Amino acid sequence: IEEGKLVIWINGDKGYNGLAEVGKKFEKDTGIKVTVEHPDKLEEKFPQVAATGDGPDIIFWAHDRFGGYAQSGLLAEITPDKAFQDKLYPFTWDAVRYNGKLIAYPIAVEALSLIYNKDLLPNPPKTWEEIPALDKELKAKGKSALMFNLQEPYFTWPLIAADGGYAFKYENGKYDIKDVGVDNAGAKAGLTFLVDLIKNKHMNADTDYSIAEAAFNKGETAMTINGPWAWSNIDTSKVNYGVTVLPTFKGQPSKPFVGVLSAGINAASPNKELAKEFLENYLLTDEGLEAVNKDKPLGAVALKSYEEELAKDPRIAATMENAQKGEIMPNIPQMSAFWYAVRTAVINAASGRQTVDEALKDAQTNAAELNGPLREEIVNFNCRKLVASMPLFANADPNFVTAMLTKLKFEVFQPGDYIIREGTIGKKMYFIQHGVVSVLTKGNKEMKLSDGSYFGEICLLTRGRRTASVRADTYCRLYSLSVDNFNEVLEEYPMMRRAFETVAIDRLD
Ligand SMILES: OC[C@H]1O[C@H](O[C@H]2[C@H](O)[C@@H](O)[C@@H](O)O[C@@H]2CO)[C@H](O)[C@@H](O)[C@@H]1O
């Protein structure tokens, strides 16, 4: 971030080129440059980087992650006046409330639908249960019935929820965080049906977003499950598609988790006023949303004036029908733990790492018990110890140490793994969070290092070989810090760079 410009983050499946057009209009009027970026794992990156001088001015995501960001102090309260508020649907404003405060601008309402190829399947099935029979019929003609993203639990959730699965029980206007529904009869039946699809070769566990998109848009599968954003690429592929009600499971509708694409203002931004002006006066207008919608459809927009037009589209009416059979996602801080829990369970069940019963038992405990803030805190202090213990960093500015912590990468090694091999060239030093290693120098004396220690640091000043091998003696958990990332932070703190250069200037004598 820098004062006088806007950096916006939005997910790579959304209309980021269209948003950049809105930004080009903004720059033309104010001289303020707008850069739109779509980094991978943006929703996880944002809370890591936002405090530490990095991060976008504006973050776009579904509202479910914003309670967490709000809890962490990473979002500015927004202050639209009543007239502006009246422009958007009251339920969209509700979705972005935390402690009664508005913490983001709602943009669009998202739900998943069944997308079907009308040439391959003129009458799409009404039930999940008839998909195996349909796939066998299609397999004989070199096709498949259904492919969709099995790596993201968002896509499998409607099935899980259909017969009674739920995230957190809603009662008397509030979520009971101790009452998780991911291990109940309904959730187990849903995921069992999905795993049986996999086991009987009607779907593949490795299927991700790209695979399913490419299969449906090339005409290889009769159906997919996706949201409005995906419709552009299907239009471009020329497939004759319909958008309809998701299939029923055990006679019960699929229950997609409804998301409200929302735009938050990073509390670290020096551009909060410019961010408000862009969001209120440029993006949230008929012209602004249209530019984004034209690139990748937004869904049912929060802006009433524009939604009046979009609601005439039967694809948007199918989206809202699915949405009404679903549930608005909670925005509570525990949602991150929930998603992490269900993601691992679905991946483990589908692959056969665990049974459905085992995977979901562990998901229940993870979603209910896991304390993100507490675990984050413990992880951050321990990393801070490791980095600040090293002689080089022993008297450095605490913010320098803090920026450096964000660069650390988690690595694991098995007994007998060489972390560093003598004669090779590395670009990383290592800190030992947990484990024992041997430092071996050809023939010689071993030296054993353990929890708290470090090694490989000479790559910070060498551009040269590894002069010793380092072998894991037990299971090791390490953090690595690369010379590039070290330099990058060292450039952000010029007083430290000068100190370290004067050190190196004397190390030549
Ligand atoms: O898979 C869990 C994931 O679900 C939701 O993410 C959606 C997102 O809302 C959509 O806009 C679209 O981009 O696809 C994502 C699924 O890959 C939740 O918003 C997210 O927090 C959660 O991790």
Author numbering: -367 to 0, 494 to 634
Give sentences from the paper.
Here, we combined ZMWs with smFRET to resolve individual specific binding events of a fluorescent cyclic nucleotide derivative (fcAMP) with micromolar affinity for its receptor CNBD from hyperpolarization-activated cyclic nucleotide-gated (HCN) channels critical for oscillatory neuronal activity in the brain and pacemaking in the heart. Although binding of cyclic nucleotides is known to enhance HCN voltage-dependent activation, the mechanisms that underlie this regulation remain unclear. (A) HCN2 channel subunit transmembrane topology is homologous to canonical voltage-gated potassium channel subunits with the exception of a CNBD following the pore lining S6 helix. To resolve ambiguity in current ensemble-based models of cyclic nucleotide association, we dissected the intrinsic binding dynamics at single molecules to reveal that cAMP binding involves multiple conformational transitions: an initial binding step that is appreciably slower than expected for a diffusion-limited encounter complex, partly due to selection of the ‘receptive’ conformation, and a subsequent ligand-induced isomerization of the CNBD.
However, a unique conformation of the unliganded (apo) CNBD from HCN channels has been recalcitrant to crystallization, with the only reported crystal of the apo form containing a conformation essentially identical to the ligand-bound form (less than 1 Å RMSD difference between the two). Hence, we crystallized and solved the structure of the apo HCN2 CNBD as part of a fusion protein with the maltose binding protein (MBP) in order to provide a high-resolution counterpart to the existing holo crystal structures. The crystallized construct lacks the first three α-helices of the C-linker, making it unable to tetramerize. This was a key factor because tetramers favor a closed conformation typical of the nucleotide-bound CNBD. The majority of the crystal contacts are formed by MBP, which is significantly more ordered as compared to the CNBD (mean B-factors for MBP = 22.9 Å2, and CNBD = 43.2 Å2), making it unlikely that crystal packing interactions contribute significantly to the observed structure of the HCN2 CNBD. The coordinated movement of N- and C-terminal domains is necessitated by the fact that motion of the C-helix toward cAMP introduces numerous steric clashes with the apo conformation of the N-terminal domain. These clashes are relieved in the holo conformation by an upward movement of the N-terminus by as much as 7 Å (compare Figure 4A and B), ultimately placing the N-terminal C-linker into a tetramerization-competent state.
